[PDB]
Amino acid sequence: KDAWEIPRESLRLEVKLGQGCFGEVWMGTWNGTTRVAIKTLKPGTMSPEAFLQEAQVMKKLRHEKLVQLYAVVSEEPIYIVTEYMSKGSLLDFLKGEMGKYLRLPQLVDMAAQIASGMAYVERMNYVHRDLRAANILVGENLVCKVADFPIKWTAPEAALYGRFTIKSDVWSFGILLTELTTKGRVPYPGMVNREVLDQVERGYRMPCPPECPESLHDLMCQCWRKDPEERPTFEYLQAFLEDYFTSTEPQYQPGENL
Ligand SMILES: CCN1CCN(Cc2ccc(NC(=O)c3cccc(-c4ccc5nc(NC(=O)C6CC6)sc5n4)c3)cc2C(F)(F)F)CC1
């Protein structure tokens, strides 16, 4: 019971946000002042240790582009409280309305910010294991942050031999690049998990998404190298994206969709 622990009182659980197997996500007010997301755990559905492992994880990881843990209610009902992100998941946001007006530059910025949060995660020798647009939260100002709550996003060695490493996160990140540039569409359209596993192993990689720049597709392809160690770092990725429109696609012109 630590200095992240708080009273449920400082927490106003205003709006529910998600329905899970082990709890619900609420949008609430912390100290009646600061807007916060609140991941509840339904006691009797999952041990506190288990549910608060993610919280313990979030503690050691303070970064501008990661969902910041804000406080915790360990003693049941077990609330985890975090900075709130107005726009919800990057997935709901890509598929959704404001998605339609997102082009490469905003998409690549997001990529960049995630790449960054993920780079932070990298420095920390942490792994995400579920890096995918559904786990990126968008904030105001297209702030996106890595959050957490799927073999299409999962690097083979991770999907197959459970070799989940930041590198397999890079892989996912590659998938997230397609989410980002397909406006949230499901990776490997028309293919189902087994067709994907079968495929990705035979060496299949998604083609260049409609109107996405080959250089962004190459980035993706790097992210999906069979050999995990060949996959780039998120320091490379971040930087590659941050600088994308100068070092990589200076001649970029907005398009219909990207
Ligand atoms: C070993 C596998 N590894 C280890 C390390 N590894 C890092 C990690 C682990 C866990 C988490 N846990 C969360 O992130 C979290 C939890 C609860 C709530 C929220 C949360 C935050 C804001 C927010 N805004 C919202 N608005 C909307 O919905 C509106 C439009 C409709 S709903 C919402 N929910 C976020 C974050 C991170 C990580 F960040 F990656 F480092 C993940 C798993």
Swiss-Prot record:
Subcellular localization, as worded in the UniProt entry: Cell membrane; Mitochondrion inner membrane; Endosome membrane; Nucleus
Sites bearing Phosphotyrosine, chain numbering: Y161, Y252
Sites bearing S-nitrosocysteine, chain numbering: C223
Protein kinase domain boundaries: 11-245
Highest rank taxon of the organism: Eukaryota
Post-translational modification: Dephosphorylated at Tyr-252 by PTPRJ. Phosphorylated on Tyr-252 by c-Src kinase (CSK). The phosphorylated form is termed pp60c-src.
Catalytic residues of the enzyme: D130 (proton acceptor)
Tissues showing expression: Expressed to high levels, and with a high degree of kinase activity, in certain fully differentiated cells such as neurons, platelets and macrophages. Isoform 1 is widely expressed. Isoform 2 is expressed only in the muscle.
Binding site for ATP: L17, G18, Q19, G20, C21, F22, G23, E24, V25, K39
Family (UniProt): Belongs to the protein kinase superfamily. Tyr protein kinase family. SRC subfamily.
Described purpose of this protein according to its UniProt entry: Non-receptor protein tyrosine kinase which is activated following engagement of many different classes of cellular receptors including immune response receptors, integrins and other adhesion receptors, receptor protein tyrosine kinases, G protein-coupled receptors as well as cytokine receptors. Participates in signaling pathways that control a diverse spectrum of biological activities including gene transcription, immune response, cell adhesion, cell cycle progression, apoptosis, migration, and transformation.
Subunit structure: Forms a complex with polyoma virus middle T antigen. Interacts with AFAP-110. Interacts with GJA1 and PXN.
UniProt protein name: Proto-oncogene tyrosine-protein kinase Src
Top-level taxonomy: Eukaryota, Metazoa, Chordata, Craniata, Vertebrata
Portion of the full sequence shown: 257 to 533 of 533
